[PDB]
Design a protein around this ligand. Structure first.
Ligand SMILES: [Ca+2]
Length: 263
């Protein structure tokens, strides 16, 4: 029931740490509402979307194919690889790898895709090449997750992430088929149910990616809107508190209810 900015500031009051929030109009790119928009937060697994953006960029350029099959071994597996650990004999295609990285937050799938483009510093270069000189990836999985403060490593700001997400989803940086593929993976997200999804009314569209980390970190990037079609981008990050997972999740779901009731 409180207005969205009030609820965001309330969430920070209750949790400690910092909460960062932006709501952007997808068609116009106008900032509709913000809180700590230019401050840095850890990205956590929300970078997996930007990673698959870079893959699809290579596909549109003729340097990659989504059906290319990648084989790997048990020695490649890292913590939290629920899809990739099931495909040791058959491997996965590049397209399956993006689906696993986005929809299940598979860490081996992300690492494998980062190998295809030459590592974290190459993802950062792709972002620079599209006009985002703020967001940076420095680490491989699973060692994003870990003790965060700060540095600037593996961080973005709400306005940078949102702007960069809008460029990927609606710009002419990717072909129409690649833009639709990226949004299809986000729509099929399986691991974000307690977050914005828990507040969404019947018949709304949502395409999202969540993140979680140490030092009270949690976040979500999402494109959503009524009647089957996305119309706004919403970015929420939090970090720096001693809050439990259940506490973090609840605050994001309450921010979500506010945003919906005041649409
Ligand atoms: Ca405050």
């Amino acid at each position: 029931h409180p207005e969205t900015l009030v609820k965001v500031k309330d969430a920070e009051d209750q949790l400690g740490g910092r909460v960062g929030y932006i709501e952007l109009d997808l068609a116009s790119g106008k900032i509709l509402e913000s809180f700590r928009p230019e401050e840095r937060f850890p990205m956590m697994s929300t970078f997996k979307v930007l990673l698959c953006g870079a893959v699809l960029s290579r596909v549109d350029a003729g340097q990659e194919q989504l059906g290319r099959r990648i084989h790997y071994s048990q020695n490649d597996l890292v913590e939290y690889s629920p899809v990739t650990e099931k495909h040791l004999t058959d491997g996965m295609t590049v397209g399956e790898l993006c689906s696993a990285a986005i929809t299940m937050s598979d860490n081996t799938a992300a690492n494998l895709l980062l190998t295809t483009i030459g590592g974290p510093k190459e993802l950062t270069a792709f972002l620079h090449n599209m006009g985002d000189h703020v967001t940076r990836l420095d680490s491989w999985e699973p060692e994003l997750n870990e003790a965060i403060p700060n540095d600037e490593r593996d961080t973005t700001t709400p306005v940078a992430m949102a702007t960069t997400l809008r460029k990927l989803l609606t710009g002419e940086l990717l072909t129409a088929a690649s833009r639709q593929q990226l949004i299809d993976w986000m729509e099929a997200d399986k691991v974000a149910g307690p977050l914005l999804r828990s507040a969404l009314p019947a018949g709304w569209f949502i395409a999202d990616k969540s993140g979680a980390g140490e030092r009270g970190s949690r976040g979500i990037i999402a494109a959503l809107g009524p009647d089957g079609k996305p119309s706004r981008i919403v970015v929420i990050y939090m970090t720096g508190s001693q809050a439990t997972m259940d506490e973090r999740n609840r605050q994001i779901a309450e921010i979500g209810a506010s945003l919906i009731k005041h649409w």
